[PDB]
Design an enzyme around this catalytic site. Structure first.
Site, PDB file in Angstrom:
ATOM      1  N   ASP A  37      -9.989  -3.065  -4.876  1.00  0.00           N
ATOM      2  CA  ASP A  37      -9.046  -2.092  -4.289  1.00  0.00           C
ATOM      3  C   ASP A  37      -9.086  -0.848  -5.163  1.00  0.00           C
ATOM      4  OD1 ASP A  37      -6.551  -0.755  -3.583  1.00  0.00           O
ATOM      5  OD2 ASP A  37      -5.772  -2.702  -2.886  1.00  0.00           O
ATOM      6  N   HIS A  62      -8.827  -4.065  -0.639  1.00  0.00           N
ATOM      7  CA  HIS A  62      -7.493  -3.647  -0.151  1.00  0.00           C
ATOM      8  C   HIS A  62      -7.127  -4.317   1.181  1.00  0.00           C
ATOM      9  CE1 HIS A  62      -4.257  -0.703  -0.021  1.00  0.00           C
ATOM     10  NE2 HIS A  62      -4.509  -0.542   1.266  1.00  0.00           N
ATOM     11  N   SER A  89       0.871  -1.209   0.000  1.00  0.00           N
ATOM     12  CA  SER A  89       0.000   0.000   0.000  1.00  0.00           C
ATOM     13  C   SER A  89       0.894   1.241   0.000  1.00  0.00           C
ATOM     14  CB  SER A  89      -1.000  -0.023   1.142  1.00  0.00           C
ATOM     15  OG  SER A  89      -1.544  -1.323   1.303  1.00  0.00           O
TER      16      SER A  89
END
Ligand SMILES: [Mg+2]
Lengths: 314, 314
Positions: B254, B284, B157
């Site tokens: 995501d 996500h 991320s």
């Protein structure tokens, strides 16, 4: 491109002469001689038969090759299989090993289409033969012991293009229901002008020049023009809504890399559920040509596993 | 449509209290108190240590958290690990379980960076702390028992964004050599305007609104403007040549789906070796939040396997 290629995939590139579509008759005769030298054993868990089924109206009956489990107790899912070969080569028998693997691992019935080939039978003949075979499969689920709500379609390369086209065509015709599409490394962009399609030029199994010849023969010389419908070249689709759950994959050294990435991106944007895998250092057909390679075994296990999961899910 | 979420991922998503970045100081204080109520994962096969290393001019010392095998009898590869948290949350300790897994399965030394967080330390501070950590790791390979030609970088991320940025920065600075980059579902596009970003608005762990807040804090309000360098937002890079072998993956649900696909495409077009996996029905952080889910276990095994494969090859 030697340094870019996974070492386990290099030796097979030297082992066979680069494919030539300057003489399609000679290429088919050579592939059929190769096929006769490499006959599979009977696999005792899978029963294989040929059948003639009604074709498109006013066209020849279509041959299908049916693979089923030796023991059927409950209703099974189905997979329509579409072989590759640039729209101009190939036969169902070439994919017997993989079709037998789908039967054994997914516990499904496979129906593999002997579609007419270009240039003799250009678009739309090969796709209409696939659609006729899908109509027959859905109509005969009684006799085959199949669940009509659990039929998908899959294929490789040109067969992947025909898979993506058939999902669009069955949607547009409110045609037989498809629960899954598996257009593996699919030949879908007739313009042949993506960076990956231009970059792959030499002996890497499929290349720009071969792609140009296959599209020219499939589209009777209309490849790349404004006179090409979405069902002939699914890259041209603008409306990808209400298509089936999609699994696809491609090697990064396949000319079809960029058109495959683009199709995946657009399917996701249209709200289609997609699983996609890009494999490093891997050229077109890597996993069929190099069965001993670790990357080939990972790729085959994953797309057999996609068939198993999606066709059998609750 | 929540019906598009994999059933095995649904239950944790309803227990997940939606993240709030309106008061980052309060959110960190809350997360640290949660951490104090649970003992950190230990592992008898992995030895964990903390070191202070020279930082950029800005911040003379950076803490790294170091994971190594209990038994080292030969030279090992190295992985610089960069935690996620939107550029504004997190600490190396949150990733102890996964770092221990990389040590045990890849047989490597992991160096996890305690980088300064935004908004107190905006760009370039977090990236310069990661770069200083990488310089120290390369400098101390003999002391760590590591091979300098087999150091990779990875993260998730925001940590994936810092991974991608650090590979560009080390290239541009002819900086320490990297043999691998693993920018997992990376936060790389500060414009926050891709179709996937606009699609994912609800309680799906990360969304358009959170992404806007993280970028605004990382870039001190210059997110989306012409005033953003490539090393702050790797989606802006036009030259992706000469970057290390890449593995990445992303869930279809995501917001980073489109920027991840686009970066993969551009890496491949630049001649970078790339493996990429798009997972269906997955939001996500799915694989960290849902360790029991089949798709989580597949995803984790594949990216742990990439570390093992790429760091140990040849
Ligand atoms: Mg042309």
């Amino acid at each position: 491109m030697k340094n870019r290629i996974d070492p386990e995939l290099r030796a097979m590139l030297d082992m066979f002469p680069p494919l030539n579509l300057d003489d399609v008759q000679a290429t088919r005769k050579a592939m059929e001689e190769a096929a006769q030298l490499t006959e599979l054993p009977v696999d005792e868990e899978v029963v294989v038969s040929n059948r003639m089924v009604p074709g498109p109206e006013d066209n020849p009956y279509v041959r299908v090759r049916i693979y089923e489990p030796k023991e059927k107790i409950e209703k099974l899912p189905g997979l329509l299989w579409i072989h590759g070969g640039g729209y101009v080569l190939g036969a169902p028998e070439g994919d017997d090993l993989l079709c037998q693997r789908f039967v054994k691992e997914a516990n499904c019935v496979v129906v593999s289409v002997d579609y007419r080939l270009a240039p003799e039978h250009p678009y739309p003949a090969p796709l209409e033969d696939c659609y006729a075979a899908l109509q027959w499969f859905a109509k005969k689920v009684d006799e085959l012991g199949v669940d009509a709500s659990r039929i998908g379609v899959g294929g490789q390369s040109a067969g992947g293009g025909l898979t993506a086209a058939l999902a669009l065509l069955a949607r547009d015709r409110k045609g037989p229901e498809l629960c899954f599409q598996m257009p593996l490394y699919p030949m879908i962009d007739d313009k042949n002008n993506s960076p990956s399609s231009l970059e792959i030029t030499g002996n890497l199994i499929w290349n720009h020049d071969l792609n140009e010849k296959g599209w020219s023969m499939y589209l009777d010389g209309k490849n790349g023009t404004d006179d090409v419908p979405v069902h002939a070249a699914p890259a041209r689709a603008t409306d990808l809504t209400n298509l089936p759950y999609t699994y696809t994959c491609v090697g990064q050294l396949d000319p079809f890399r960029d058109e495959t990435l683009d199709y995946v991106k657009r399917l996701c944007q249209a709200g289609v559920d997609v699983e996609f895998h890009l494999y490093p250092g891997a050229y077109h057909g890597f996993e069929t040509l190099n069965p001993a390679a670790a990357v080939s075994q990972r790729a085959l296990a994953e797309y057999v596993g996609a068939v198993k999961h999606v066709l059998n899910r609750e």
